[PDB]
Design an enzyme around this catalytic site. Structure first.
Site, PDB file in Angstrom:
ATOM      1  N   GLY A  44      13.275  19.286  -6.968  1.00  5.73           N
ATOM      2  CA  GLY A  44      14.221  18.793  -5.984  1.00  5.73           C
ATOM      3  C   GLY A  44      13.521  18.309  -4.731  1.00  5.73           C
ATOM      4  CE  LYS A  47      20.498  14.388   4.898  1.00  4.57           C
ATOM      5  NZ  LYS A  47      21.233  13.757   6.030  1.00  4.57           N
ATOM      6  CE  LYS A  66      12.644  24.988   1.287  1.00  4.10           C
ATOM      7  NZ  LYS A  66      13.516  25.953   2.011  1.00  4.10           N
ATOM      8  CG  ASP A 154      22.646  25.412   4.047  1.00  8.22           C
ATOM      9  OD1 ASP A 154      23.710  24.777   4.142  1.00  8.22           O
ATOM     10  OD2 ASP A 154      21.610  24.927   3.564  1.00  8.22           O
TER      11      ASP A 154
HETATM   12  N1  LIG Z   1      13.437  29.473  -6.613  1.00 14.76           N
HETATM   13  C1  LIG Z   1      13.786  28.285  -7.113  1.00 14.76           C
HETATM   14  N2  LIG Z   1      13.942  28.168  -8.454  1.00 14.76           N
HETATM   15  C2  LIG Z   1      14.338  26.992  -8.956  1.00 14.76           C
HETATM   16  N3  LIG Z   1      14.600  25.850  -8.310  1.00 14.76           N
HETATM   17  C3  LIG Z   1      14.442  25.995  -6.985  1.00 14.76           C
HETATM   18  C4  LIG Z   1      14.045  27.148  -6.320  1.00 14.76           C
HETATM   19  N4  LIG Z   1      13.982  26.929  -4.951  1.00 14.76           N
HETATM   20  C5  LIG Z   1      14.342  25.674  -4.820  1.00 14.76           C
HETATM   21  N5  LIG Z   1      14.644  25.050  -6.006  1.00 14.76           N
HETATM   22  C6  LIG Z   1      15.143  23.678  -6.188  1.00 14.76           C
HETATM   23  O1  LIG Z   1      14.781  22.885  -5.062  1.00 14.76           O
HETATM   24  C7  LIG Z   1      15.968  22.456  -4.351  1.00 14.76           C
HETATM   25  C8  LIG Z   1      15.713  22.440  -2.860  1.00 14.76           C
HETATM   26  O2  LIG Z   1      15.254  23.731  -2.401  1.00 14.76           O
HETATM   27  P1  LIG Z   1      15.668  24.402  -0.989  1.00 14.76           P
HETATM   28  O3  LIG Z   1      15.139  25.744  -0.658  1.00 14.76           O
HETATM   29  O4  LIG Z   1      17.193  24.585  -1.091  1.00 14.76           O
HETATM   30  O5  LIG Z   1      15.178  23.329   0.091  1.00 14.76           O
HETATM   31  P2  LIG Z   1      15.787  22.437   1.272  1.00 14.76           P
HETATM   32  O6  LIG Z   1      16.069  23.396   2.478  1.00 14.76           O
HETATM   33  O7  LIG Z   1      14.883  21.317   1.705  1.00 14.76           O
HETATM   34  O8  LIG Z   1      17.100  21.891   0.698  1.00 14.76           O
HETATM   35  C9  LIG Z   1      17.058  23.400  -4.847  1.00 14.76           C
HETATM   36  O9  LIG Z   1      18.394  22.988  -4.567  1.00 14.76           O
HETATM   37  C10 LIG Z   1      16.666  23.568  -6.318  1.00 14.76           C
HETATM   38  O10 LIG Z   1      16.952  22.406  -7.094  1.00 14.76           O
END
Ligand SMILES: Nc1ncnc2c1ncn2[C@@H]1O[C@H](COP(=O)(O)OP(=O)(O)O)[C@@H](O)[C@H]1O
Ligand SMILES: O=P(O)(O)O[C@H]1[C@H](OP(=O)(O)O)[C@@H](OP(=O)(O)O)[C@H](OP(=O)(O)O)[C@@H](OP(=O)(O)O)[C@H]1OP(=O)(O)O
Ligand SMILES: CC[NH2+]Cc1ccc(-c2ccccc2)c(Cl)c1
Length: 326
Positions: A44, A47, A66, A154
């Site tokens: 993914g 933003k 991440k 969130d």
């Molecule tokens: N622990 C995880 N396992 C699997 N997919 C993940 C995980 N963490 C993030 N993702 C994927 O990455 C996306 C974005 O991560 P996120 O922490 O929500 O970042 P941001 O704050 O930039 O949106 C998620 O909506 C999911 O698709």
């Protein structure tokens, strides 16, 4: 000015705790070695970050990396501290490592991998039991973080990872999460539009944990009525109008009067007058198999304009809707 407010539960948890716990700006962050991780594929891209599936070569274990984008350093520290504070908590994503790319010095958080079953495939195969089951797993995660003096801010489907095959749920994305201090005035520009609570939309800054309870209600409503999002606003002002088309304008005026809130003049020509709609009016042939009197009674207790009037995560866990899981 506006009437002050404080949480009905876990009010003073941070006050009685040492500064070390909540002072994230003073917390010492130790950056590990990115060479222990081999990047596999993009998962993914939000933003605020880029998310990758990876392998920890020192074990052959699957992780999630991440990478974090250009943001205030303060915010990065806050996310790290909250994650470390909540590590080990029920259904809280586990921060496994903090790493920095040797060359560009780009910060990256390393988490446990969750095999997130398809969201577009889940929505169609979930039963009345599955909804009750996963709603309870989210409540365990919220009761825990609220008890540790933290509000997620969130809560939404995209921030909830579900491995349906193993019935495993993780609450992710703690980048907007914050320490709750009674009487503190917070930034209202948090959460995603559809899940923003009325407090944020009327610019009421002295909010608490209950914000997450509103967001949870929006998710439940979308799940049992099969309408995503439940409150479809085109903008932040329109978002409140959408809620008003459901909860009605009489209780909205009761809410802003109780807290001596001043409505922004942008609301003058768009709010109108709306009657309160009965939750049953949302039941249709396509969703009636996920709806029950207990689901409607439970939803009604989450979706309240008054943040103080909403069920707490603990009260929600005791609701008759969860008897078949509990
Ligand atoms: N622990 C995880 N396992 C699997 N997919 C993940 C995980 N963490 C993030 N993702 C994927 O990455 C996306 C974005 O991560 P996120 O922490 O929500 O970042 P941001 O704050 O930039 O949106 C998620 O909506 C999911 O698709
Ligand atoms: O998408 P918006 O313009 O914000 O409005 C949506 C949209 O309907 P329209 O776009 O045609 O107005 C939805 O449809 P989709 O875009 O999701 O296909 C619809 O729900 P459905 O998905 O069931 O069509 C929903 O509610 P409704 O259909 O009851 O109007 C409605 O919300 P608003 O009525 O608040 O615009
Ligand atoms: C992209 C990840 N989304 C996965 C997802 C799917 C369903 C729900 C869900 C489950 C039960 C009730 C309401 C919602 C949630 Cl929170 C997240």
């Amino acid at each position: 000015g506006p009437v002050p407010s404080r949480a009905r539960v876990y009010t003073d948890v941070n006050t009685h705790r040492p500064s070390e716990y909540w002072d994230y700006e003073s917390h010492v962050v130790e950056w590990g070695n990115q060479d222990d991780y081999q990047l596999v594929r993009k998962l993914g891209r939000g933003k605020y970050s880029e998310v990758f599936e990876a392998i920890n070569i020192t074990n052959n274990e699957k992780v999630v990396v991440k990478i974090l984008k250009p943001v205030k350093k303060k915010k990065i520290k806050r996310e790290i501290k909250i994650l470390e504070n909540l590590r080990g908590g029920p259904n809280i994503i586990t921060l496994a490592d903090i790493v920095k790319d040797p060359v560009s010095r780009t910060p990256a958080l390393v988490f446990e991998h969750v095999n997130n079953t398809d969201f577009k495939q889940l929505y169609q195969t979930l039963t009345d039991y599955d909804i009750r089951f996963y709603m309870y797993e989210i409540l365990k995660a919220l009761d825990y973080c609220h008890s540790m003096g933290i509000m997620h801010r969130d809560v939404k489907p995209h921030n909830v990872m579900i491995d349906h095959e193993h019935r495993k749920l993780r609450l992710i994305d703690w980048g907007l999460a914050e320490f709750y201090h009674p009487g503190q005035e917070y930034n209202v520009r948090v959460a995603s539009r559809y899940f923003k609570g009325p407090e944020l939309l009327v610019d009421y800054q002295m909010y608490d944990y209950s914000l997450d309870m509103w967001s949870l209600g929006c998710m439940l409503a979308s799940m049992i009525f099969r309408k995503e999002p439940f409150f479809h606003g085109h903008d932040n002002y329109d978002q409140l109008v959408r809620i008003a088309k459901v909860l009605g304008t009489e209780d909205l005026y009761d809410y802003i009067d109780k807290y001596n809130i001043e409505l922004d003049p942008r609301f003058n020509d768009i709010l109108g007058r709306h009657s309160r709609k009965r939750w049953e009016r949302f039941v249709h042939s396509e969703n009636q198999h996920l709806v029950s009197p207990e689901a409607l009674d439970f939803l009604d207790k989450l979706l309240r304009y008054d943040h103080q009037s909403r069920l707490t995560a603990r009260e929600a866990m005791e609701h008759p809707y969860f008897y078949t899981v509990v």
